[PDB]
């Protein structure tokens, strides 16, 4: 559907599946996986060369074409902040006779550049904050779309318009060059980039059509982690509350309950960056109740304490609208429920999930949703179950502020702190 290049994984390779049959040469330094993600590193053979079908390039003067892809750009090093902010490097290039387009990164900025044969140049970029307690962009998969017509170059992020440059002063742009995927410029040996679903269209895509591609390419039967990667069974995870972004869970001292604490922040002295620590709190693990965690699966939410796997329970007969959850050894007990069904109540794209307690894998009764609540101690916030959430999650549009919304944070080389 107006698609002229469609890079996709196949047989430990990336191949153009557009139907136009371009040649794609992936060199040995490119890391691949069957989830369609590919990784560009600093090494020289870490590259992809694409040789276009010379019959279906973009129009050099009307400039009617679009580029879409997902990207995951690692966090800055706390001690490489000035190189991060200042070094620009190219990630993807399509140039012939010093004309064409390129995609560049400069720290927290992603840049689109057009160059006409006359040598005239125009750019448009997207930039994200590097001071946020919790950023939705740093080290997390997000969707980029660049569109061009004769007058404007635009960047959409996650289906929404972010930037807009007039490109009227741009004349003829040569269209038929090889597309080169490669980090190019002054970069660190540890600098890398993840990408997926790279596509080129011979049309200016509309926001409506882009917002749809974002939804379609966001959809999966499985859940995702904080970074946007698949959520897995048998993997250690930190827990994030999308309703309480700055809070984390700690097992209360010598007590089988989860207290909620405030995340520690970047405390060094640089005035360019700020963040909250992500690698803190209890370390959890998802177990099946009988690979990838799928919506509606039945699970156990466990965690590690005293070199042992403990479990998260709810008291069967709690009276109030909410109650503290019981965090305790794995045990048979008729006073507690252990069965959780994992949910995604949001209809829009998200990395949040919800955790519903039930009697078993057959029952239709719903006990409550795992969340956060302030308890009478002076008050104190605890890790809780709640039936209050059960009606709130019915509300449209989905309420993002509900503390029943969780994300799972595994360690990742793109996030150091």
């Amino acid at each position: 559907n107006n698609i002229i290049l469609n890079l996709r994984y196949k047989d430990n390779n990336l191949i153009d599946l557009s139907g136009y049959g371009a040649k794609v040469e992936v060199y040995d330094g490119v890391e691949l996986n069957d989830k369609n993600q590919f990784k560009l590193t600093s090494s020289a053979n870490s590259k992809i060369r694409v040789t276009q079908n010379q019959n279906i390039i973009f129009n050099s003067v009307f400039l009617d074409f679009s580029v879409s892809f997902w990207i995951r750009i690692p966090k800055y090093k706390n001690d490489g902040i000035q190189n991060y902010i200042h070094n620009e490097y190219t990630i993807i290039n399509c140039m012939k006779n010093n004309s064409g387009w390129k995609i560049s990164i400069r720290g927290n900025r992603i840049i689109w550049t057009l160059i006409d044969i006359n040598g005239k140049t125009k750019s448009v970029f997207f930039e994200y904050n590097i001071r946020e307690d919790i950023s939705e962009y740093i080290n997390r998969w997000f969707f980029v779309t660049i569109t061009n017509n004769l007058n404007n170059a635009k960047i959409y992020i996650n289906g929404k318009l972010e930037s807009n440059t007039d490109i009227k002063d741009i004349r003829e742009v040569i269209a038929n060059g090889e597309i080169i995927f490669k980090l190019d410029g002054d970069i660190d040996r540890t600098q890398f980039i993840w990408m997926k679903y790279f596509s080129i269209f011979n049309t200016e895509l509309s926001q409506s059509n882009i917002e749809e591609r974002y939804k379609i390419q966001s959809y999966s039967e499985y859940l995702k982690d904080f970074w946007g990667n698949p959520l897995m069974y048998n993997k250690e995870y930190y827990m994030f509350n999308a309703g309480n972004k700055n809070s984390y869970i700690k097992l209360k001292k010598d007590s089988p309950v989860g207290e909620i604490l405030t995340r520690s922040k970047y405390n060094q002295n640089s005035k360019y960056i700020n963040y909250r620590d992500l690698y803190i709190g209890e370390k959890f693990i998802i177990r099946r109740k009988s690979d990838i965690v799928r919506k509606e699966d039945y699970i156990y939410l466990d965690f590690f304490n005293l070199n042992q796997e403990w479990r998260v329970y709810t008291y069967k007969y709690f009276k109030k609208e909410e109650e503290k959850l019981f965090l305790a050894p794995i045990s048979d007990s008729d006073e507690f429920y252990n069965t959780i069904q994992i949910k995604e109540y949001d209809e829009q794209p998200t990395y949040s999930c919800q955790l519903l307690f039930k009697k078993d894998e057959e029952s239709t009764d719903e006990i409550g949703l795992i969340g956060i609540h302030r308890f009478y101690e002076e008050y104190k916030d605890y890790f809780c179950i709640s039936k209050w959430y059960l009606k709130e999650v019915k509300r449209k549009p989905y309420n993002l502020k509900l503390g029943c919304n969780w994300q799972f944070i595994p360690k990742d080389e793109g996030w150091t702190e």
Binding site: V257, Y315, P329
Partner: peptide, 15 residues
């Protein structure tokens, strides 16, 4: 039996 001590604490906590 250590578990029982934990359960007892839990019931303190919610009462």
């Amino acid at each position: 039996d250590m578990f029982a001590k934990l359960k007892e604490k839990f019931f303190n906590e919610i009462n």
